[model samples]
Target: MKLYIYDHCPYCLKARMIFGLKNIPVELHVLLNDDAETPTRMVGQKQVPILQKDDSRYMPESMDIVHYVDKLDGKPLLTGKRSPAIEEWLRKVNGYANKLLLPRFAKSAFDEFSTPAARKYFVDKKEASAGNFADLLAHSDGLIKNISDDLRALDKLIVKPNAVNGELSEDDIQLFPLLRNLTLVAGINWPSRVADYRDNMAKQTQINLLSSMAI
Candidate 1:
């Protein structure tokens, strides 16, 4: 198997973490920041972390890659009686955390990386983005708390004597790597309750692929 990825992409980090946790040996092709050719050729889209199982079979999207790898390794990440509910909630929280929060941070960091004039433009954009982020987060005070509690629950759930779904399930697999990347980009002391969850998450021994988003 070959995994085509970029170093700093949270999605790529998620896929990499799954492979690491599963102990799957795959050839990794690190693409340049501007390079989209390999991904495009493999999956008809310019997305990093494309997985090629051979010349003929390929998978795109982080969650799909995770599911595929889980199936192949015979260590299913989605299990138990509430598998569907678990999967749905995982998707929701992952979207909330990654799609909503991470982009604001990325835009701010991008603005910080620009020149003076460009920086001014980005500053305005960042503030607007931050305000939007706060509004989105304010919809539910318990949302962030729920995600944090889920991680702690997962840690305890995996350690029980009769643990049915004993390993890191899809929720863990999906959220951990993105949380790890977010922490590295903004630091674990990031000024949000969601960010605090990342800090508490980092202290867990079950999360083996936790890493900074350094390239």
Candidate 2:
């Protein structure tokens, strides 16, 4: 089994997280941002986190891959109930978190953006939704203030170190990637609980936080 991913993609992180949590062995392949043909030939679309099953069949969609892998041993780790509070928080943060993340990702040395053309592909795509990278970076101080406040609200919603609501759930799958991406930004105040949960999940999922590359 193998999974194709772009290092900076949150949906790819969601798919990768499930395999790590289960201790399941799978080959991971990183695709360059500009390489649309590879994914298009595999799954009929240009998207990351596409899974190649043991039978060599291709599957797309992050959560679908997560569900299939989670059921592999006839036991699932994401067995907790979804939290309405966290769900609401995600809705708000998802809208603006990219403003902070996209500019940083465009500048970083991720495998997907290795080539100049590949990096340009990501920059052009994200800048469409996030505005100019320079403009976004210029507004970083205000964006950091807003997200720090959101983190305080999220800290109150964390139920435990390993799970968001006392057990692993869909909420963790949704929430962790956003928090991991946020690590690329400097100067955001992470409340204690949120920080601990982010650190714990990063350890559990074997996914590195971009704190070292923080802008």
Candidate 3:
């Protein structure tokens, strides 16, 4: 299997962690434009974490890629059972994609790891999707406060041993990279509940593997 990825992309990080936990090995590919048609030719869409199985088979979307990789180990990592808290929070993990996080991410050292061919495009895209990166930075304090409020809202209710019912679940997969991005790029001091949940999760999962291509 071949996986197209880059470290700075949070969804790609999520896929990498799943591969690590499952002990799955994959040939890694990097480059935002990997073909004549750009990334879209490679996977029909420009997205990281594209899993190329064999022949013409390819998979996109981090969660879907995670599910396919989970099958390699037959460990049920993405299925089985989960608490309502886990399911609920998992549904909201898209909060990781919250535009508030983008300005800081683009401005931070994290962008140093992005593909040079696409780094400025990443910032440009963020600005196009949201607004001016400068304004995103200007109102960052307020934006982050709102984002933090969203995370904290789940803290008490989710009450995690982190893993779903003390075992890995699809929901856990969703929350990990989301929180990781918020913590790593946004530099938020996690709310008490969020902090405690991550601590518990840290004890349960380990993800250390080689980068696809070091920046």
Please list the residue runs of candidate 1 whose C-alpha ends up more than 4 Å from where it truly belongs after superposition.
Answer: 75-77, 80-167, 185-215
- For each of the candidates, the C-alpha root-mean-square deviation to the true structure, in angstroms, is 7.3, 0.9, 4.8
Predicted structure with the largest lDDT when compared to the true one: 2
Which candidate gets the maximum TM-score versus the true structure?
2
Q: How high is the CA lDDT of each candidate model?
A: 0.54, 0.92, 0.62
Question: What stretches of model 3 exceed 4 Å from their correct place?
Answer: 27-29, 32-41, 54-58, 80-97, 111-117, 185-187, 199-215
Which tens-of-lDDT digit does each residue in 1-215 have in candidate 2? Answer: 99999998999999989998998888999999999899999999799889999999999999799999999999988889999999999999988888888888999989999999999998888889778889889999999999999999888889898899999999999999999999888999989999899999999899999889888
Give the alpha carbon lDDT tens digit for every residue of 92-208 in model 3.
656444565666555444423356655676777668887887765677667666666777776665534556355577667766666655664343446786766666654444532
Can you list the residue pairs that collide in candidate 3? Answer: none
lDDT of 1: 0.54
Give one digit per residue, the lDDT tens place, for model 1 in 1-215: 88887544667767776666566777877664444466677889777788888565888998888778768857664563434544554566565554334444344433123445544443355557555545554543454455555544444333222221344555555555665654432222233444444444444422322233321
Which regions of candidate 2 are displaced past 4 Å? Answer: none
Candidate number with the higher lDDT (1 or 3): 3
For model 3, state the Cα shift of residue 202 in Å.
Answer: 5.5
Which is better, 1 or 3, measured by TM-score? 3
